[PDB]
Design a protein around this nucleic acid. Structure first.
Ligand SMILES: COC(=O)NC[C@H]1CN(c2cc(F)c(N3CCS(=O)(=O)CC3)c(F)c2)C(=O)O1
Ligand SMILES: [Mg+2]
Ligand SMILES: [Mg+2]
Ligand SMILES: [Mg+2]
Ligand SMILES: [Mg+2]
Ligand SMILES: [Mg+2]
Ligand SMILES: [Mg+2]
Ligand SMILES: [Mg+2]
Ligand SMILES: [Mg+2]
Ligand SMILES: [Mg+2]
Ligand SMILES: [Mg+2]
Ligand SMILES: [Mg+2]
Ligand SMILES: [Mg+2]
Ligand SMILES: [Mg+2]
Ligand SMILES: [Mg+2]
Ligand SMILES: [Mg+2]
Ligand SMILES: [Mg+2]
Ligand SMILES: [Mg+2]
Ligand SMILES: [Mg+2]
Ligand SMILES: [Mg+2]
Ligand SMILES: [Mg+2]
Ligand SMILES: [Mg+2]
Ligand SMILES: [Mg+2]
Ligand SMILES: [Mg+2]
Ligand SMILES: [Mg+2]
Ligand SMILES: [Mg+2]
Ligand SMILES: [Mg+2]
Ligand SMILES: [Mg+2]
Ligand SMILES: [Mg+2]
Ligand SMILES: [Mg+2]
Ligand SMILES: [Mg+2]
Ligand SMILES: [Mg+2]
Ligand SMILES: [Mg+2]
Ligand SMILES: [Mg+2]
Ligand SMILES: [Mg+2]
Ligand SMILES: [Mg+2]
Ligand SMILES: [Mg+2]
Ligand SMILES: [Mg+2]
Ligand SMILES: [Mg+2]
Ligand SMILES: [Mg+2]
Ligand SMILES: [Mg+2]
Ligand SMILES: [Mg+2]
Ligand SMILES: [Mg+2]
Ligand SMILES: [Mg+2]
Ligand SMILES: [Mg+2]
Ligand SMILES: [Mg+2]
Ligand SMILES: [Mg+2]
Ligand SMILES: [Mg+2]
Ligand SMILES: [Mg+2]
Ligand SMILES: [Mg+2]
Ligand SMILES: [Mg+2]
Ligand SMILES: [Mg+2]
Ligand SMILES: [Mg+2]
Ligand SMILES: [Mg+2]
Ligand SMILES: [Mg+2]
Ligand SMILES: [Mg+2]
Ligand SMILES: [Mg+2]
Ligand SMILES: [Mg+2]
Ligand SMILES: [Mg+2]
Ligand SMILES: [Mg+2]
Ligand SMILES: [Mg+2]
Ligand SMILES: [Mg+2]
Ligand SMILES: [Mg+2]
Ligand SMILES: [Mg+2]
Ligand SMILES: [Mg+2]
Ligand SMILES: [Mg+2]
Ligand SMILES: [Mg+2]
Ligand SMILES: [Mg+2]
Ligand SMILES: [Mg+2]
Ligand SMILES: [Mg+2]
Ligand SMILES: [Mg+2]
Ligand SMILES: [Mg+2]
Ligand SMILES: [Mg+2]
Ligand SMILES: [Mg+2]
Ligand SMILES: [Mg+2]
Ligand SMILES: [Mg+2]
Ligand SMILES: [Mg+2]
Ligand SMILES: [Mg+2]
Ligand SMILES: [Mg+2]
Ligand SMILES: [Mg+2]
Ligand SMILES: [Mg+2]
Ligand SMILES: [Mg+2]
Ligand SMILES: [Mg+2]
Ligand SMILES: [Mg+2]
Ligand SMILES: [Mg+2]
Ligand SMILES: [Mg+2]
Ligand SMILES: [Mg+2]
Ligand SMILES: [Mg+2]
Ligand SMILES: [Mg+2]
Ligand SMILES: [Mg+2]
Ligand SMILES: [Mg+2]
Ligand SMILES: [Mg+2]
Ligand SMILES: [Mg+2]
Ligand SMILES: [Mg+2]
Ligand SMILES: [Mg+2]
Ligand SMILES: [Mg+2]
Ligand SMILES: [Mg+2]
Ligand SMILES: [Mg+2]
Ligand SMILES: [Mg+2]
Ligand SMILES: [Mg+2]
Ligand SMILES: [Mg+2]
Ligand SMILES: [Mg+2]
Ligand SMILES: [Mg+2]
Ligand SMILES: [Mg+2]
Ligand SMILES: [Mg+2]
Ligand SMILES: [Mg+2]
Ligand SMILES: [Mg+2]
Ligand SMILES: [Mg+2]
Ligand SMILES: [Mg+2]
Ligand SMILES: [Mg+2]
Ligand SMILES: [Mg+2]
Ligand SMILES: [Mg+2]
Ligand SMILES: [Mg+2]
Ligand SMILES: [Mg+2]
Ligand SMILES: [Mg+2]
Ligand SMILES: [Mg+2]
Ligand SMILES: [Mg+2]
Ligand SMILES: [Mg+2]
Ligand SMILES: [Mg+2]
Ligand SMILES: [Mg+2]
Ligand SMILES: [Mg+2]
Ligand SMILES: [Mg+2]
Ligand SMILES: [Mg+2]
Ligand SMILES: [Mg+2]
Ligand SMILES: [Mg+2]
Ligand SMILES: [Mg+2]
Ligand SMILES: [Mg+2]
Ligand SMILES: [Mg+2]
Ligand SMILES: [Mg+2]
Ligand SMILES: [Mg+2]
Ligand SMILES: [Mg+2]
Ligand SMILES: [Mg+2]
Ligand SMILES: [Mg+2]
Ligand SMILES: [Mg+2]
Ligand SMILES: [Mg+2]
Ligand SMILES: [Mg+2]
Ligand SMILES: [Mg+2]
Ligand SMILES: [Mg+2]
Length: 46
RNA sequence: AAGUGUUUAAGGGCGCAUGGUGGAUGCCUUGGCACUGGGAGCCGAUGAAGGACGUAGGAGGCUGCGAUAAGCCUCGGGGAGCUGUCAACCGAGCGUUGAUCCGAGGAUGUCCGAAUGGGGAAACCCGGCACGAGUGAUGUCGUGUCACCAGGCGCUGAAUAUAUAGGCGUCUGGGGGGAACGCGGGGAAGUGAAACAUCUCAGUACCCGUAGGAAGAGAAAACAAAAUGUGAUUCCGUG
RNA sequence: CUGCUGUGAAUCUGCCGGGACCACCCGGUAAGCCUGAAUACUUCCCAGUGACCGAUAGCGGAUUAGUACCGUGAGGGAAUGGUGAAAAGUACCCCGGGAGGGGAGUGAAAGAGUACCUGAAACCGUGCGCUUACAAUCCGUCAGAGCCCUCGACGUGUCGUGGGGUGAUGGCGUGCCUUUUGAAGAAUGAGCCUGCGAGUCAGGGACAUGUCGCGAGGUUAACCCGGGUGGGGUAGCCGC
RNA sequence: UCUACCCAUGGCCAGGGUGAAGCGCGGGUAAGACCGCGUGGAGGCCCGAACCCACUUAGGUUGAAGACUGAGGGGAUGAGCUGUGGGUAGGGGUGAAAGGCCAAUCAAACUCCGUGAUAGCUGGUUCUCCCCGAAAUGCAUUUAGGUGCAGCGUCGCAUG
RNA sequence: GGCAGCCAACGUGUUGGCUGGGUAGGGGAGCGUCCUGCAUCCGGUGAAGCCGCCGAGUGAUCGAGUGGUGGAGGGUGUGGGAGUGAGAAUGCAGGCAUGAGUAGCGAUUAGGCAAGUGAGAACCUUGCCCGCCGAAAGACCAAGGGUUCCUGGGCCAGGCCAGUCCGCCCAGGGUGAGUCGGGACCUAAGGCGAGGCCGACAGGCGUAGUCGAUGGACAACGGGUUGAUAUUCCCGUACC
RNA sequence: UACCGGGGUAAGCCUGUAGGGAGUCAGAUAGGUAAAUCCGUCUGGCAUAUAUCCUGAGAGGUGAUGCAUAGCCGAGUGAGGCGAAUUCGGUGAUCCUAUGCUGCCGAGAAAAGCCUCUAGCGAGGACAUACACGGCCCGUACCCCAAACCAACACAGGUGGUCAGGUAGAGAAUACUAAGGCGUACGAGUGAACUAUGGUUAAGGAACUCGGCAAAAUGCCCCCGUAACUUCGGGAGAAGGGGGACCCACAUGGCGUGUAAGCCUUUACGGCCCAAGCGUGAGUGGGUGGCACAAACCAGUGAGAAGCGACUGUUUACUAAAAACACAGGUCCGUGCGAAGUCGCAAGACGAUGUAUACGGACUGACGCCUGCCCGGUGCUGGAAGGUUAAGAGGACCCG
RNA sequence: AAUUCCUUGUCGGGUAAGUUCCGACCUGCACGAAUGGCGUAACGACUUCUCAACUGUCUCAACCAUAGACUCGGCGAAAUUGCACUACGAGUAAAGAUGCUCGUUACGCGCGGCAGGACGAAAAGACCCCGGGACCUUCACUACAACUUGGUAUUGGUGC
RNA sequence: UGUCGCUCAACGGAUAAAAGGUACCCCGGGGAUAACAGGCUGAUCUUCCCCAAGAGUCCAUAUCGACGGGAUGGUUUGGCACCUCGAUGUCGGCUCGUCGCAUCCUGGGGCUGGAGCAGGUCCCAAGGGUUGGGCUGUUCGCCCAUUAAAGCGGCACGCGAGCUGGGUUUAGAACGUCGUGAGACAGUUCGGUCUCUAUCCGCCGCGCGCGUCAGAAGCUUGAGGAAACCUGUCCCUAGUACGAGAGGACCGGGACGGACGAACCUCUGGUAUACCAGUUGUCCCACCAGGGGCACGGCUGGAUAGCCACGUUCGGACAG
């Protein structure tokens, strides 16, 4: 009986790992935002 | 007496007649696809591309707009109906003294975003200075302005003498985005070779730096072959 | 021709090219810069076209679509169009808690009722006819009794150049596909229906073979001029 | 955001045993060594809940559950367990080392792109009829279930 | 007695002789589907599609032969062009069978009766009993969730049965702080990082700084009140 | 006389008890990136006091004529009014004094804040009382061991922290139970086989089986009594055995606590003693009852010997927990210091704010007794007399 | 012997009976000294053998309760599936027949049960072979990083 | 033009240039190809036979039968590669069986180098029976007590959609050995997931329907099936027959058992969830007394009926 799942939600950690400001820090992340915008995604980031 | 002999359908099968389910088929379309001829080929610190949150007399989505919020002003068009739409229903109003609507030019344009007063988990937290408003005063509220770097111009010139590095002040720029096309750099592998390393795939995919409306190239230290030759570059057809 | 690393000249008798190199001729004048047109492309805007698609097609997206939904994230990523000319969308009555239905209305039609054009098949019912509970069945086929229906002539049913439905009973009879020397095979694939799903296209390409034009000649490429599919264009190419 | 290890900062460990060093006193001695009796409360110490494990067994095995449940079992002041916040990234990480683990996937994660990768291999390839009609041999082969040429089919032309 | 291929014989297409099992495979000739140039014809006096009847051809198949359904296009001839034919790929999408009215309906506590509500009650409400947890199955939070909370209404989806009930559907309402938990205070690991150093470019590190609680500092307690908030509102008494 | 329910009330502000912690004044100084009366350091004088001061549980007072409450009125929508007593003891924390104290080795954040010192500001300024005022932003509903979070489900799994009633009990185990909360969402029947989960069993007692797998057994407290061997710690709860209930007496006893009275004094939040009252074992003697006195639940099986590994630990998330890994201990090799090693293209970083008693790598693996022979092969270390050997130099001779 | 092929070696012990176990012998297929040798108190959910106690493990099984199973009401799946009014024997066949031959047996339809067959279901056999991958090794080949040699540039002066 | 340079010898000559491991394995394929089972064959194996050289004092043939020869069977090891690699799970044990006779016991016989008892060998016979333990994963085998006897084989070496999982044969680890190494070993050692709700046939049970020439009811015949079928010891006959003795019967009678099966519950014994009693902890019924709830039916001592075996009774014939 270990029963611990992989997804342990934490909103701060979500933002710090996947958030808008993180993405914008690097060229790769900025490319991600541009690509999702080009696809027409409503949500560009976490 | 012996012998002959129909006569059940619990249920099933097959055929037909009537239905259900389902959404094929036929015929369509407010949507696509491939192209042709034109236009425009950039937008951004005067804050972009794209967003968050708001905004109509009534809940939400799409559309429009930004606290002046389905809108404000001006110049033109237009001519009887209008208050975007899903979407009506109710409740109120405008318009021949020209509404709704269409075109052009202005005004307003919260917050986030290069994001740039400082900070931050984008759209939310906290300020300096100047002017104004408001308080009995503190608190509070408007409107400007305050990142960094590069390059002009002015002042100053450390250790240290000459000086210089640097430090103040001020003006002018840059930053980010965009489907393809350009130029200059970096540069695979699957694969082919019926194995594989040279070679191929291929200077392809991808990546980096920069453009422009196109770019690059361009005005012979060129070709040619004895012809009394041609005469910048680019691009197309041949060879 | 050109990068990096060394070395390192001449100013016209100079120097650099004419596929190692040398000589002779020829061409040109490096180590400075700028330069339009012919060429490439279309996020976006305007006007059009199609021997292009027509809702499992065409864009992933005709429907809140890059949405719902999936993933921590990069990222992945659907499904859903048609009433009728007009909403005239069924007042009112009846059964029912509703749902739904039956009368009555509207409509050309409700065999058009917001579950809506047409309404196939699988699949699921109800009714009628024949058949089936002593039988061993790849499920059918060829003979065939009996019953039911129908078309002719005759008469009360009975026969025919008949036609259908069902079928007691007899003979014969080992699914389909793939793949194998050989499979009913106890080898592979298929639960069923509907829809979709595989030799296509480009190039004066190559060889062959039809066909058409011209013929010792045939033909143009780019390009130019026509709102066209037409006219022009000799560079080439292939024969000789 | 699972998991491995590390960094910073917090929390948690019922109850009951055992009795190290040190200290004190009394024996003992010339002084000691040494020996009793207290005090003391040490330890990857003992028994045992929470908590952390997963040893044996039965059940589950289209589960209640993509790893669990019941019954017993081990550790339980420590190389302990745990919260919050943080760090290391793919030929790389981390590993008290099982090639373990790195989001139910690991002898090289996942996603998109090159990309419709390539398969001498397996499967599939859809209407009809008319005429003809094979081969499973020879030679060679990084060849033996592949392929080239020959042999054997067909269509056309020629020769009869 | 019908059809066909090859060949012969003559004729302005008939007669005769021979031949006609067939996988891989070669050759020949056709059927059906769609889109089109041209020419013709049919169609609200009812096109296509679909379901039948009665018939037809050597086959793919046909019916400008006819009923029913249906509602707007279709046929034919001759040419041009194909997303042109499926039964099978453990093929794909949708619909639906078989297993089958079968297995299950998710613990280790357990329900019973009376009365009420209602169209309907084993499951909803109230009362009286019974049973279970009680280092929890009680009470209060962080994380996470996001209106699930309260009142009124609802009962065709959802709830593994039913349902008048619901954590489900609908409308309205509800969250009040100088002291609580955070910011405006402080720093840890770590992150970012003016200049800077390093690195072909992309970038890698890092100084001054500036962020970053799980820690440091810092002022409120008891009582009452709403259907739903309370160290927040109110009362009493405090503190910064 | 028996029984049931009450037998309540915070922060703050007074007061400064238990406990803990402290010497003070004077002279000199540029060590504290300038200065200092502060701090540090050095020299002198005066101190061992219940002296003084700081800190601090709690008792007591106030807060409180208030608030709250057992009940009682009527009256039911459930709102409203009235409202007693409130003493003394015992027991007792995992909470407080306590960031204390004592012990130990592994030697145990930072910054703000607060205090103080000058530098530097200064003509105005400090303090107290009264009155009138400002005190921003975000969260605040509800669930939160769960059908509201992570689990595709109204899923037997998972989820950190804070409260801890009573009787048995060592206990937060376990049994029953209070407050509070549930009966949790398919049911009703029915003695089929069979499966699952529990229960009992004549006689026998491992004959079962790969194997005592699974069950059964042992189990608590207080006494008695315990071997080989040993690293002298252990082994050890070794083994083996006895007692345990209830009533009465000893007992107006013993022990803990401690009021009245009394005694002492530094008279106060003092000290000594203490009948009563309350709580509480252990033992001894006699009796009483049962089949059974650890009464249920709870709760070691023990012994002899061998192999491996010394030991506590660690490991294949999801078939292996071990003899594998780790380990303390050992030896070798490297490393003289932005070391060696490692990450990185570099800068830079870790190693380490370490310096050979250190750090890295390798093999071995507590401890005891020990660890022989071989340097031919292949590595590693050192050497360079020979053989061979790149680019760079040279440039004979030859060829156009 | 965790090492011994022959091998259940041989002798002793334990048992009524011992291929395992304990003590020895040495004929070590094929122990041996930090891939340490031989021992070792303590320790072990390790592995092995023996004994006491205890028992449904067994002789040998019986009975009780609960949850399913079963019946009634409600809701309502799944894997599988070319067909179907799906007997048996002895044969025959791609050599193991419900489906072919000859014969035998058998009224139609269900319910509860058992698992011999349907070469039952699941999963394009993990074995083996053929073709292709991957990762690992090394005195296989060819490269590259890193390290290292000399020349030359940065790089100079005076002396021997 | 002439000629030279290749153990390119894998010699039609893939590169000028190349070895291994995988039990950590993965994918595409094959029953074109092995490991299990089936099938063919039958060398080998097995069972029997033909000839009779000899052995047996003499005497081939009571009993053995050399050298050679001919076959059966198809359970051994093989040979072959025909079905199955889009899956036919293995050894041993357990449970349940079913068939053959080449018969282990019991039954019936011939011949004996059969006096008797007890045997040897061959023929006929398959109804029933054919034990429990120690060692090993074992099959096999050896051993310990018994027995009338402790038969040999087939059925996918019967039986894992019935169970087990000790051996073997995944991944961990270790020893010896081999390999420079990754690794390897029909060498050894410790450890290591055994899935499935039964549609069809088949089998065990139980109903519904219809039929058997009207609708019903009681009692029946038995075509045809199924079950059952074992055996010992002791005492008489008899210490007789036979025999030197030792020893010791056939045939025919009687009693008492083992194993197995059936029915049954009087007895003995087991069970007992609404029976009675005792008793611990706790909560409750205000309280005492008396009771109840919960803790395995709390625990403990008993326990009629039902069900049951360890119990009771009966069976296997007798005759044709
Ligand atoms: C594991 O299941 C299957 O592969 N199923 C598919 C086929 C193959 N097969 C089978 C079974 C076996 F047990 C063996 N054995 C015997 C024991 S052994 O001596 O260890 C050697 C291996 C075999 F070779 C083939 C079967 O039954 O069907
Ligand atoms: Mg421009
Ligand atoms: Mg900003
Ligand atoms: Mg910033
Ligand atoms: Mg100067
Ligand atoms: Mg730019
Ligand atoms: Mg290749
Ligand atoms: Mg290839
Ligand atoms: Mg230009
Ligand atoms: Mg030249
Ligand atoms: Mg230029
Ligand atoms: Mg359609
Ligand atoms: Mg579409
Ligand atoms: Mg993922
Ligand atoms: Mg998401
Ligand atoms: Mg109509
Ligand atoms: Mg419909
Ligand atoms: Mg319709
Ligand atoms: Mg009949
Ligand atoms: Mg027959
Ligand atoms: Mg026949
Ligand atoms: Mg074959
Ligand atoms: Mg063939
Ligand atoms: Mg088949
Ligand atoms: Mg079949
Ligand atoms: Mg195959
Ligand atoms: Mg299939
Ligand atoms: Mg311990
Ligand atoms: Mg673990
Ligand atoms: Mg099951
Ligand atoms: Mg233990
Ligand atoms: Mg413990
Ligand atoms: Mg300690
Ligand atoms: Mg993190
Ligand atoms: Mg391994
Ligand atoms: Mg994983
Ligand atoms: Mg790889
Ligand atoms: Mg490619
Ligand atoms: Mg392909
Ligand atoms: Mg022919
Ligand atoms: Mg060929
Ligand atoms: Mg033919
Ligand atoms: Mg013929
Ligand atoms: Mg063909
Ligand atoms: Mg047609
Ligand atoms: Mg009409
Ligand atoms: Mg049409
Ligand atoms: Mg097609
Ligand atoms: Mg189809
Ligand atoms: Mg299909
Ligand atoms: Mg069905
Ligand atoms: Mg069934
Ligand atoms: Mg059933
Ligand atoms: Mg059921
Ligand atoms: Mg339930
Ligand atoms: Mg009622
Ligand atoms: Mg209920
Ligand atoms: Mg209870
Ligand atoms: Mg509610
Ligand atoms: Mg309500
Ligand atoms: Mg409902
Ligand atoms: Mg329902
Ligand atoms: Mg920092
Ligand atoms: Mg940095
Ligand atoms: Mg910078
Ligand atoms: Mg901060
Ligand atoms: Mg904090
Ligand atoms: Mg509330
Ligand atoms: Mg007080
Ligand atoms: Mg009072
Ligand atoms: Mg609340
Ligand atoms: Mg949920
Ligand atoms: Mg749950
Ligand atoms: Mg408890
Ligand atoms: Mg529930
Ligand atoms: Mg239930
Ligand atoms: Mg039962
Ligand atoms: Mg017994
Ligand atoms: Mg007994
Ligand atoms: Mg035994
Ligand atoms: Mg046995
Ligand atoms: Mg044994
Ligand atoms: Mg056990
Ligand atoms: Mg037990
Ligand atoms: Mg001992
Ligand atoms: Mg007595
Ligand atoms: Mg160990
Ligand atoms: Mg221990
Ligand atoms: Mg351990
Ligand atoms: Mg595991
Ligand atoms: Mg395990
Ligand atoms: Mg270094
Ligand atoms: Mg070494
Ligand atoms: Mg070791
Ligand atoms: Mg031995
Ligand atoms: Mg021995
Ligand atoms: Mg040595
Ligand atoms: Mg050694
Ligand atoms: Mg060792
Ligand atoms: Mg263990
Ligand atoms: Mg039941
Ligand atoms: Mg039912
Ligand atoms: Mg058969
Ligand atoms: Mg047939
Ligand atoms: Mg079953
Ligand atoms: Mg069969
Ligand atoms: Mg199968
Ligand atoms: Mg395969
Ligand atoms: Mg293999
Ligand atoms: Mg390879
Ligand atoms: Mg050759
Ligand atoms: Mg040759
Ligand atoms: Mg070659
Ligand atoms: Mg495979
Ligand atoms: Mg074969
Ligand atoms: Mg098999
Ligand atoms: Mg075989
Ligand atoms: Mg077979
Ligand atoms: Mg062959
Ligand atoms: Mg198959
Ligand atoms: Mg015989
Ligand atoms: Mg008989
Ligand atoms: Mg077998
Ligand atoms: Mg089986
Ligand atoms: Mg291994
Ligand atoms: Mg070696
Ligand atoms: Mg184990
Ligand atoms: Mg084993
Ligand atoms: Mg009879
Ligand atoms: Mg019969
Ligand atoms: Mg019986
Ligand atoms: Mg009786
Ligand atoms: Mg009673
Ligand atoms: Mg009471
Ligand atoms: Mg009483
Ligand atoms: Mg109770
Ligand atoms: Mg009893
Ligand atoms: Mg009894």
């Amino acid at each position: 009986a270990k029963g611990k799942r992989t997804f342990q939600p934490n909103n701060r950690r979500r933002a710090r790992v996947h958030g808008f400001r993180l993405r914008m820090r690097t060229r790769a992340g900025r490319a991600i935002v541009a690509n999702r915008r080009s696809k027409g995604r409503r949500a560009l980031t976490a």
